[model samples]
Target: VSDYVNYDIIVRHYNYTGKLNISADKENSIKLTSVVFILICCFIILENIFVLLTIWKTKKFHRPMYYFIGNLALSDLLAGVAYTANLLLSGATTYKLTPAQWFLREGSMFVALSASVFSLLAIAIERYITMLKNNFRLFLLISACWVISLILGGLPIMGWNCISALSSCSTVLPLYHKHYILFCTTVFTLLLLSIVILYCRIYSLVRTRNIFEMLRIDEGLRLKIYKDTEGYYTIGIGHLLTKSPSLNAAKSELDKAIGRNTNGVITKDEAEKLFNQDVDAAVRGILRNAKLKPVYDSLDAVRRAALINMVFQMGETGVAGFTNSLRMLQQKRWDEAAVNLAKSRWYNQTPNRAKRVITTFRTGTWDAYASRSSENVALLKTVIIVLSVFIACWAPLFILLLLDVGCKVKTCDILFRAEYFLVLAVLNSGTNPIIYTLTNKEMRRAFIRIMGRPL
Candidate 1:
């Protein structure tokens, strides 16, 4: 136990000055320690490089906050490099380095890391002064940080180096450990400074949290409540409430049937006004919740009105149920999406209501329903045409079969006519789908969309 790395040891024998001491045990673990530090260094380097490059490449990022952030990244990146070098200089983990080399490595690592810490402090304070001198105060503070970082790093290099004081703060270390004392003092100071500076930064950020020109609402109305996908019942079309409304508020006056509240009966006119107001609000919620505000804005007014009306009928989720229809709308396939809607059971459920929806989906307008009769009518028309063609083709052959007028061996004209009608009939069979596609504008578009350019 005594011989273990952080544990005590008897009086040490030394090979004398300029070389660091190593307990035999820590000597054995040197490679593992170096490996761990090197791995940590990689992540530090990677993250810093990622942000630094982002700041440099984006033109909009050229601001004081980003400027300070980029500086932070630079310092961290270099600190990582220095720490990797310092790991190589650690005596328990490496070959005998001259006292000069050991301090040099410690000095470099300390200075760079301290610079990282100082950069953080500067960023925090600069924000506090956000809205400073010849910028002189800023430059001056940064200079002081550099000067102090050098002093701290010098502690280890100038012979106050440690004997693994990092393992424990209590003086469980040997005597010549002047390095440990100075090193501990500097590190503790930096960490304490960082904590204070971080708190200051938070304060600075807080100060900007409510600027009158930007986020300021009236004093009593200065409320902000955040809700999930389920929002609250807010008042006014300016219904934008930064303030959290209590359940007890009388803002409900603006709610209810525009002119009055209930004795239990709602007038037809009152219901209309209530729904009219709810319609716009519902559309807005639908746009926001489904995250289609961009689509809602970009669409023409005619298209927008229909979608706004849709929210009331379907609510958002009901409208959302038309996955394919919604996607087609995005693609600008007005005719095709309408056709898809009409094909659904929705049309069967409430044909008149669906008529308006299907119209808007196809025409991208609220008023016009693409006005095609039902698929049944179209099918019946196709059936009539095919039967007429069949009657023309086989009329004489049928006569022969009827009234004992058999051509057991059919006559040439009968056979020829029958063959003609049969050919025509088979050809007619393919015409029905073509007629449907041709007569139905949406089907035509859908076929063209699937096959070639839209007719």
Candidate 2:
């Protein structure tokens, strides 16, 4: 038996069936991620500090829009610290989180997202109110937005109903199939729907109103024309006579006479032949009764003709095509809208010499629509644009959740994708304030003013 030692038995004993193990590269990844996070944190801190300072220093900056901007900046600073700090520590260490720790991570993200969204909404509403109504209701609206956002942000942490698993933390939860559906639906209704409605109203107002009418003016029916030494002209018309019915009639007559006379060139002999009997009387009537005063001491017949030309052109309505184009843009039909904007009569009529000035006005119109400052009546429009962009970005994640609810996909796949969107949502808080700082003049100035002074 000893001589017959079983080689087969020895081989069988050596053979093993066990789980394969691979070493995680988490340490190296953690180090790289940590460095990136630190860099981001530094940038955010410095930028936000500058923003706060600017806002505080400028006295004219203490408006509702600026108030929202300041609040947003503060939220962003907090989010950056909380989000990066959590990632940095969690990545650098090997400690497995407790249930409470996991909840905290999820909670922080929720707060960050909620704060960012609401802050943006607040800014939109502020722009809408201030720009459209010239009202200060933005302050109250921003306060309400913050309150509501904070409450919503806290909901996930409180574990109300829709909690699902994120990478290392749980998101808004019942962690069940149906609850995710409810969560997505609720968000869509509350944020997206409200914003859409608001913007629609704003766009409607801007579409119908005249932008020039909104400019502040002093009383006077005054017209001025300046002729430079280079033979160029600058013309301005202002009506100072607020309540003189006779003044309007005189102006109307004068406008008509000027319109008819400038239709073609008139020789001095033709002018004398046309008005030889009443020319002096008409001139005296204009100087005496009408409030027309020529600015230049020495006026050639050519200068007079040019002044009449300026008055005729400036008296009629200015370019309104840009406003119409903005309406199409507000509806989210970008291509058709862009074409309409470029082909506008205003754009076409823009003189080659005045192209730069006209282009500036056109650009301002586009900015007004996109930035949510088109008109005093379009506050809601701005809100809607912001909401729409947010919803579009988050739609993919919500769809996956819906699919899971319907049993079309597995929970694991949905969960993996959800993590990606959650990161985006968390990052959104930082994005909004950055947008305000870059795009809004008042906001930028206010932030700069705030940073210059203590506190």
Candidate 3:
């Protein structure tokens, strides 16, 4: 041992100026958050109770849609409690939550949100089918939706990369960890868009008379006679000829007489002749119905209507548009790529008008396209905004960290200051249930009904 024990050097190394102190105001903020958290818990509990009661009381509401709504309520209730518990624990204790606890909280929230979102999507599809197809069974479709949602919610538990430590708390497949997040997001977005488009097509079919008119048979073909029934050839007797093989052969032979080849009894030539004659008669009948009125043309209007529906359902650019924009990025045409992406119809047709407005507002910026029409945009903005605020609020502290990272300042001498932005990011999982309940009508209704209100 050194005779002096290096006392002077030890004394010089002790610097206390860099330590962070939580102010009374910060404590008050935490208290306020706790109050909010408790309220949220109460709301979730009451909502779930009401949901169970409603299902038990009203057998009429036991349909598939309501079942999905029940599942959504259950997920949200679990998520809210898990998240609030995590937040409360973190706030009250000086020690950070264990990795396992953090993961449980985060994973539960993520799965809950995912299930809720998919449930809403299922509701939208169910509405489309009921309103348009009229072919889907309510019970089967609802059961399928719930099954699918459960599978999706269970994905993380099956070893797919999920809630992981990111500095402070866990996140839903962090941006840097794996590309699965992007993959899942892309898949769901496309799936939702496809359902919307299919519904539009169904609507077109139901609303139009053109298909019926095109399918109609002509009066002449409708009236063609078979084998001289009484002296007069009876019109609207095609079925009689069709019913008799001998009459069909005669018609085919007659068709072959006019430079037409009736290859067999039901030849293409005969079918064409029959169709043309039928069309002529049908047209004459239509004209008579119209009192010799001008041609009732509607192809243009129908085409325009279909196109508009396509734009609405699929976005102007659609999947091809996104793929093209990505290619533009790969080619390093940043400006052109950004323009191509911004002009894409994805945002234009997003269900959220505010998101569309934001994308339009932030044109020509990376953030504009990066955050465009995404439900995650608010969380991302919160992260950035919190970081910016911290940097501005405590400039001296950040300067020291920057200096330490640069090796200009020693890490041992500096206080280990953790960024609060990660905390914000982690807490973001909690907001998703709020978002679901707020924006989704089915979710809102379920929550209300679960809280014992008439829906």
Candidate 4:
């Protein structure tokens, strides 16, 4: 192995030292391993490059989290480069390098790994802090993550290694001490657990807000008593004060924040508590209702939130009335369920609200209805409905025409008397005019602007 450096020269004059170990038998597998390693390294670098490029190119991604994401991508990219370099410098080439170069190679790998973990931890902390809502110094936090990683990585190179003491050397990385590796492991483990804990808190906080916003949007928060569309005495997010013993009993406490409550009032804080209790009850109702139990686990968070929203609006009994719709949802027939919901009287009265809820059910996304500017969505939905109607109305008449050709026994008579089928075909013609008008020049300009494209 002429390519291998002489260990006698590399060792120098150490009292007791760990040497770079190698074998001819193990060298056979190095070629295959290097191929696989280089392939994976290229993949990692390419993926990170896209992430870094996106963060660099997009101005909207200049936020703190995106900055942290870019840092993570950078570390990962370096990790890929360092790993490939480490692989190439390893095997037969290990002894070819000077001790300083070897330390640099190993240290760079360590730094990249540590920096990636730290970047993730920083992102988690950023999210947790944001959930609590605070802004101080993100750059400081990012720089600290890199600084700490650099210090840790440089420790082994700066005389914290086991080069002078073989017994203290780690089996995994012969140049590094066992104690140093253990310390790094412990720190990384703690960071992993901290990230997990932060995410759990973040998810809980998001869901809590989800419930609050759902009621706020659907019921419209009112501190004072107001008559709903059906003339029910409701206050504080559709909390029916009339014919409600619990609310009646707790009227004084509910109105405690605002002392002057003769006109039937509720303070904002108490209203929030009331809404929480209602939400809890609705959750309990959903769990107890066996029809929803099987499908609940199959649903996404948005769908689950939609169910809670429905329960809050109409109670379990009112929701239970939608038997066909529920059955359709259970079978994963989203469009059919939406159609069934459209047939209801509630859809007629509260068309806007019902449309939002139904669209969420169909699309299984909050963006469908919760968007700030839903006008574009409204037009698109109208176009889709018109298309659906056109297809549905004409399909039966075409099927009848095909059926007549297949079975010619008195088929001509059946075709001549197909007045009902002809009526359906004519209805499709009426829907086309609306479709043409809906997708006009004004809508095109608006859509182009929304898509950030030239008209």
Q: Against the hidden reference, what TM-scores do the models get?
A: 0.36, 0.50, 0.39, 0.70
lDDT of 3 by residue, 1-455 (tens): 44322332222222222221332236767787678767766676665656546656666556655565566566556666766675676543422443334335445655654555565566545444443232266556546655665566555545554233222111212211233344444555565456457546644643342222222321122334344333322223132233234655655545544355433334444444554454344444433532111222222332222222222223333323355544443344544544654555644544353243233222422242223222222322332232233224333433433333333222333334343433343333334344445554543564455544574
Name the weakest run of 10 consecutive residues (lDDT summed) in model 4.
Answer: 13-22
Our tally of clashes for model 1 stands at: 9
Top model number, TM-score: 4
Q: Over 4 Å off in model 4, which ranges?
A: 1-22, 129-136, 223-233, 244-250, 253-269, 290-298, 372-455
Candidate 4 per-residue C-alpha lDDT over 125-197 given as tens digits, one digit per residue, 9 for 90 to 100: 6655543453357777778878998998888777787655656654334455657766765676577667666
Model 2 segments more than 4 A misplaced: 1-27, 89-95, 131-147, 156-181, 211-414, 417-420, 441-455
- Quote the positional error of residue 454 for candidate 3 in Å: 16
TM-score of 2: 0.50
| Whole-model lDDT values for every prediction | 0.47, 0.45, 0.42, 0.64
Per-residue lDDT tens digits for candidate 1, residues 1-455, read 33223212212212121123324545556677568757867776765665566556555545554565566567667767776676666545334554355446546755765665566556555544433224465557667877887886566545454444422211211222533444444564556456465554544443223211111111111122222223443332213322344542333443343555433334444533444465556666766755456557666645665565556444777677777877777777788778878888767776876686567556553234222212322322332342344344334423322311222221223432232332232232233233434554433443334422331
TM-score of 1: 0.36
lDDT of 3: 0.42
- Which stretches in model 1 have alpha-carbon errors above 4 Å? 1-22, 26-29, 91-95, 131-144, 155-455
Candidate 2, 245: how far from true, in Å?
A: 17
Extract clashing residue pairs from model 3. Answer: 50-450, 51-450, 218-278, 222-236, 223-235, 223-236
| lDDT, residue 16, model 4 | 27
